[PDB]
Design a protein around this ligand. Structure first.
Ligand SMILES: [Mg+2]
Ligand SMILES: [Mg+2]
Ligand SMILES: [Mg+2]
Length: 761
């Protein structure tokens, strides 16, 4: 049979661990494959190898299935290990620490690999890809047909089957700032489906049993394969989980009548289906700068923010207790879920391919960090190459380290092309065979095959037998090259072409992510001399391409390790064709900006695309200050010449102050948020953040953790910052300290783009 895995789990059925894999067989029905014979294990690097002595020693701390002697590679060198095999995954920590002792071994490896990932790696199970399985049909498991796996074969090239996708959105009462699931009810919950269905379950005035019951019944009725939400792992699932407990209605949404569990990376597992949180993947997009559902929806063109209902999120209770405002609160919820499913149609095909690459399941591929995603790929490659994985220190991850090469001049630039140099790093590492296992140390016999010296960092690498990291990149390049030519078979506007284009890009992203991973100090295959050698090779040929660009009529405004910005001309085509012929690197125009504004001498800029979209790169205001930080950027980017830019900006910054002193503001725009992450009076701040969180003790009841305050400065005699009234206590007055909001933010927000203008009235 052909299987296509969606989700993987495991249980411990009476002292024997059992792996389950849920998927979609070749005949298009949802089944579950099971394996009871696999068992967890880890390696122990022995100086003297005695498995029987080892086994009996380890048997005192936990039960041991076996202790085998294996020969595997370690940084290329073939060494001997003890393969300690536990009976159940839970005992692996006890055996890991105990092993260390009784010097047979010196170190332990691969003891922290989660069990169901261990199984798929060792058996070659690739998620979101058709696998070949010999499997006996052995009755049902719940409603699902169960199959005992005999042996896994490989994977077959083949397109994804149709999946039942369910988008869902919620809104919670929240009359008091950040809601609490113990009493605050789930007011509305919409669902939208790939079939075309939409429904909204609304509560009865402060009672939300009907809606949780309706949500659960709908999920069971529709039986979705993927559940998509926006920040569903962050808020929705944790709230519904704890709300369903308080009301005593079970949140049984998974395929075995079970409730969601919070799991790795903070993602929420729904057994037998893929719970995808789109906010996990959009956080990685550096262009968006704000990343709310409505604004991300506009960037990807699924819903125009100006053609859409928008409620100030902090006031869903107000629209709920008002029958005039309830029908518009509904359309707000519908526009949310329609955008959520809209985003999914654009992003989910990519995530499915990024899951079959790298090898993480669909519910985890986006939740994991880029380096975490790459490391699970290298573990899969390390297995089929017979290589034992090194050990880790911690996870912090650091996205990609943009080392500046050509510092820009802060100012305005028109007609700018951004050239992508990300494919440079695999080329460098393959062509020069850079890898932890190929680096040379105070032993310097140059092997007969030869050596390559990194430009004046002076590190030496073997040309020899290809290293581990180059071998992986070589395979990724080959896979993509094969997929990319198969796309020529189909016409560019076909479903079959777009699917292949997503798979092609997914391979590219994982290949180009290597460079960021190998610099991450908390990486398994981290070696400082590799990263430094990759940069030095990278810096050397960038200076070549900037010098050759000058031989053409091409101005270079900015250039760092991963990209350089150039002025749009006909000559660019020769610069790109030069880098291919000279360096063997494929360069592509990443962005075509009509105008660009560099505020500082770093990669801090805003850019105006030809279609009109602005995107902003690089880094406690009110929402009016945010509005005027935009507009100002949009006014500068749409003005020709710098002189026009001031007169446009200063007129706008004055007109806002004019209406602000004329008392025509909406109060919502004046609220200043702060989220209160820890204890009150622990870091004794003294600011308006704490003082506003003090006036809530007359009548008010809250101080606790996880609660956003929202304050407005009001006129009156007092200390600096100590006039912060909460926004519910301005009793229809609209007498606000305007001198505060003009002087220390509305002007400074515009002055954060003051590359030409000072404080003016
Ligand atoms: Mg939501
Ligand atoms: Mg899962
Ligand atoms: Mg809310």
């Amino acid at each position: 049979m052909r299987f296509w895995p969606l989700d993987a789990t495991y249980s411990v059925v009476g002292g024997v661990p059992e792996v389950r894999v849920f998927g979609v067989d070749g005949e298009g029905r949802r089944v579950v494959l099971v394996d009871r014979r696999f068992r967890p294990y880890f390696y122990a690097k022995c100086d003297k190898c005695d498995a029987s002595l080892a086994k009996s020693y380890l048997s005192r701390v936990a039960p041991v299935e076996a202790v085998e002697v294996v020969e595997r590679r370690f940084f290329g060198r073939p060494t001997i290990f003890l393969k300690v095999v536990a009976k159940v995954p839970e005992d692996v920590r006890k055996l890991r620490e105990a092993a260390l002792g009784a010097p047979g071994v010196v170190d332990v490896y691969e003891a922290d690999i989660r069990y169901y990932m261990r199984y798929m790696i060792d058996k070659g199970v690739v998620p979101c890809a058709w696998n070949v399985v010999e499997a006996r049909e052995a009755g049902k498991l719940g409603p699902l047909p169960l199959y005992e796996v005999v042996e896994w074969a490989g994977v077959e090239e083949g397109f994804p089957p149709p999946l039942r996708v369910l988008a869902f959105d919620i809104e919670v009462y929240n009359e008091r700032g950040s809601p609490d699931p113990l009493r605050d009810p789930v007011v509305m919950l919409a669902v939208k489906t790939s079939d075309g269905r939409e429904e909204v379950f609304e509560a009865e005035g402060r009672d939300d049993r009907r809606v949780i019951r309706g949500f659960v019944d709908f999920v069971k009725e529709f039986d979705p394969d993927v559940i998509v939400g926006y920040n569903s792992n962050g808020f929705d699932w944790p709230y519904l989980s704890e709300r369903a407990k308080a009301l005593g209605v079970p949140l049984r949404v998974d395929r075995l009548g079970g409730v969601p569990q919070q799991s790795v990376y903070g993602h929420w597992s729904v057994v037998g289906r893929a719970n995808v949180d789109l906010y996990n993947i959009v956080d990685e997009f550096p262009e968006i700068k704000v990343k709310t559902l409505d604004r991300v929806a506009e960037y990807f063109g699924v819903m125009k923010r100006s053609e859409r209902v928008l409620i100030p999120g902090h006031k869903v209770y107000e629209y709920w207790n008002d029958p005039a405002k309830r029908p518009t609160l509904m359309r707000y919820v519908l526009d949310d879920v329609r955008s959520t499913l809209g985003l999914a149609e654009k992003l989910l095909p990519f995530l499915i391919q990024l899951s079959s690459v790298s090898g993480l399941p669909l519910d985890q591929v986006a939740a994991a960090s880029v380096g975490n995603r790459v490391e699970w790929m290298l573990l899969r490659y390390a297995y089929r190459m017979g290589e034992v994985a090194p050990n880790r220190e911690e996870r912090e991850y650091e996205p990609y380290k943009g080392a500046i090469v050509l510092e820009p001049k802060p100012g305005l630039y028109s007609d700018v092309l951004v050239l992508d140099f990300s494919s440079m790093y695999p080329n460098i590492m393959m062509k020069y065979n850079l890898s932890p296992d190929t680096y040379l140390e105070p032993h310097e016999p140059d092997p007969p095959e030869g050596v390559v010296v990194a430009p004046e960092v002076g590190h030496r690498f073997r040309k020899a037998p290809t290293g581990f990291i180059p071998a992986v990149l070589k395979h990724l390049v080959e896979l993509r090259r094969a997929v990319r030519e198969e796309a020529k078979k189909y016409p560019p506007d076909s479903p079959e072409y777009r699917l292949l284009d997503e798979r092609q890009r997914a391979l590219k992203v994982m290949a180009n992510a290597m460079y960021g991973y190998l610099g991450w100090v908390g990486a398994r295959w981290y070696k400082k001399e590799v990263a430094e050698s990759v940069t030095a090779f990278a810096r050397a040929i960038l200076l070549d391409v900037v010098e050759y660009a000058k031989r053409l009529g091409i101005e270079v405004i900015y250039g760092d390790t991963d990209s350089l910005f150039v002025k749009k001309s006909g000559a660019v085509d020769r610069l790109v064709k030069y880098v291919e012929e000279r360096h063997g690197i494929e360069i592509k125009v990443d962005k075509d900006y009509e105008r660009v504004l560099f505020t500082e001498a770093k990669k801090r800029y805003a850019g105006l695309l030809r279609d009109g979209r602005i995107d902003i790169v690089g880094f406690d205001w009110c929402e009016l200050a945010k509005e005027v930080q935009l507009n100002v950027v949009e006014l500068i980017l749409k003005s020709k010449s710098v002189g026009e830019a001031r007169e446009r900006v200063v007129k706008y910054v004055r007109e806002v102050v004019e209406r602000l002193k004329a008392y025509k503001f909406d109060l919502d725009d004046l609220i200043i948020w702060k989220t209160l992450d820890k204890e009150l009076d622990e870091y004794k701040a003294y600011g308006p953040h704490v003082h506003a969180a003090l006036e809530l003790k007359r009548r008010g009841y809250k101080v606790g953790k996880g609660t956003t305050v929202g304050y407005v400065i009001v006129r009156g005699p007092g200390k600096v910052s100590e006039r912060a009234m909460p926004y519910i206590f301005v009793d229809d007055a609209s007498k606000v300290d305007v001198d505060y909001y003009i002087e220390k933010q509305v002007i400074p927000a515009a002055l954060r783009i003051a590359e030409v203008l000072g404080v003016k009235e």
